[PDB]
Each structure stands twice: as structure tokens, then as C-alpha cells.
């Protein structure tokens, strides 16, 4: 068994909340991880290309959200 994702961290938070903005998705990421803003931004770009999540331009920011029928 193996996989093609970075970490569950960013998927575990946003799924619950509904729609999370760029500053919001980053706000859920604590110092225990040692990550930076640039890290989550580059990780999103993998989620959104890999059919997990989608993203829209709202609140003069991006809104990152899941999609369903």
C-alpha cells in the first residue's frame, strides 16, 4: 500500500467547516508542524489538481471548498 497526498491535516479541518478562505485554512495550522503560509498554499494546489477539493475567488481572497452533486 502507498498514497499520493502531503498530509491529512488540511483535509481534516476544511471538510467540517464548509468553505474556508486562504487566511482561514492557514489559521488551522499550529507550530507543532513547523510549517509556513507558503507551505499550505503549495499543498492546496495539489489537492485542487487531484480532484479532492475546489477553489473560488471570493471576499477579495480565495475560498477553498469541497464540491458535491
CB 56 within 8 A of CB 65: yes
CATH class of 1-69: mainly alpha
A 10 A CB-CB count for 68 gives 4
The experimental technique behind this entry is NMR
Cα separation, 34 vs 19, in Å, equals: 25
48-58 burial, b at 16+ Cβ within 10 Å, e below that, comes to eeeebbebeee
Domain boundaries, the chain: 1-69
Instruction: Give me the helix-helix angle, 37-49 and 9-17, nearest 10°.
Output: 70
Amino acid at each position: 500500500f502507498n498514497v499520493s497526498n502531503a498530509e491529512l491535516i488540511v483535509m481534516r479541518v476544511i471538510w467540517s467547516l464548509g468553505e474556508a478562505r486562504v487566511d482561514e485554512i492557514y489559521a488551522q495550522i499550529p507550530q507543532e508542524l513547523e510549517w509556513s503560509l507558503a507551505t499550505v498554499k503549495t499543498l492546496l494546489g495539489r489537492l485542487v489538481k487531484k480532484e479532492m477539493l475546489s477553489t473560488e475567488k471570493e471576499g477579495r481572497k480565495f475560498v477553498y471548498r469541497p464540491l458535491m452533486e
